[PDB]
């Protein structure tokens, strides 16, 4: 009966968390293996027990242990039984990491007066959840908590939500979630919150939120300095970032399905990693004089992008900044870019006809792996020295034209 002891009742294991006299608390599950269901329980509703008794002692079930309600296939390929829905009693205060990994429950129902405060990392990753209404008591959602819940279509938060923090990739890899409303209480969002999600049309922010804003379904920081997420299914053909924007967050236009023309504003300094990854309709993008940093794979898989003009003052390029741009016809490299890093331009570049290098430095540098491009691409450069640098470093024998002075 001591702390850490396993109590097994009706083929459910519980592990003692606390005990004092005849009052204690348990987690449901040993934290290692999942609860095994009976054949008759397959595809039927199930309620997590709330209280267990051992002699004159009473243990309240306060936590769902890691793996307790996870669904895993068996090496034999036999059917592994699992309920169609799970009801969580008010006594549950925490869902440990992977408590419902891969869950086949289509819904999770909370009994009235939930005490649920924390959903830990990956609690519902790869789940078959279709709908869930999170209780007001919930304050924290862990990393990748609902990631890869491909059938999740409705995710809401009860009135008077206390939700303050939603961690990294909590709503990543989703395929059927068309909208979400962040409660007024949300203060912190982890990075890549919607990474690889393909379904959102709009992300709303409850009136009064002090940290975030929603403008035409686009998520920003309240001060509009950070464009956090542009919904992939927002159907506008053209868009202009607001004048206050200083950065595009990582994955902010990931999987974008409809945008064709994007105008960035002067004052924007940074484009995050994967910002335009798989933005498959983007044809034109205006990059500002203020742009300083373009991170890894910001331009990746842009199936319709026709041209790129890198502005004159970019200082920092991440690894593989431009890759897989099959309709890119031309690239221009701005005036004060005098050093081209490794892995700058590569991948499918079927339409690339020309690269214009505007720099005039006597110290211009290229690495042997800066370019991995078709030999048919033509370069336009300002001096014979820059042509010499290209000839010495290019893996291909491209035509290089030195412009007249």
Characterise the protein shown here.
The protein is mainly β. It has one domain: Leucine-rich repeat, LRR (right-handed beta-alpha superhelix), CATH 3.80.10.10. Helix content is about 0%, strand content about 30%. Strands 1, 2, 3, 5, 6, 8, 10, 12, 14 and 16 form a 10-stranded mixed β-sheet that branches. Helix 1 links the parallel strand 36 and strand 37. The N and C termini lie far apart (about 90 Å). The relative contact order is 0.05.
What are the SSEs and their pairings?
Layout: E1 6-9, E2 12-20, E3 23-28, E4 45-47, E5 51-54, E6 57-64, E7 85-88, E8 94-95, E9 107-110, E10 118-119, E11 131-134, E12 140-141, E13 154-157, E14 165-166, E15 179-182, E16 188-189, E17 202-205, E18 212-215, E19 218-221, E20 226-229, E21 238-240, E22 247-248, E23 261-263, E24 270-271, E25 284-286, E26 293-294, E27 299-300, E28 307-310, E29 316-317, E30 322-323, E31 330-333, E32 339-340, E33 345-346, E34 354-357, E35 365-366, E36 378-381, H1 384-393, E37 400-402
Parallel strand pairs: 3-6, 4-7, 6-8, 7-9, 8-10, 9-11, 10-12, 11-13, 12-14, 14-16, 15-17, 20-22, 21-23, 22-24, 23-25, 24-26, 26-29, 27-30, 28-31, 30-33, 31-34, 32-35, 34-36, 36-37
Antiparallel strand pairs: 1-2, 2-3, 5-6, 18-19, 19-20
PDB class: choline-binding protein
Keywords: choline binding protein, leucine-rich repeat, choline-binding protein
Assembly: monomeric
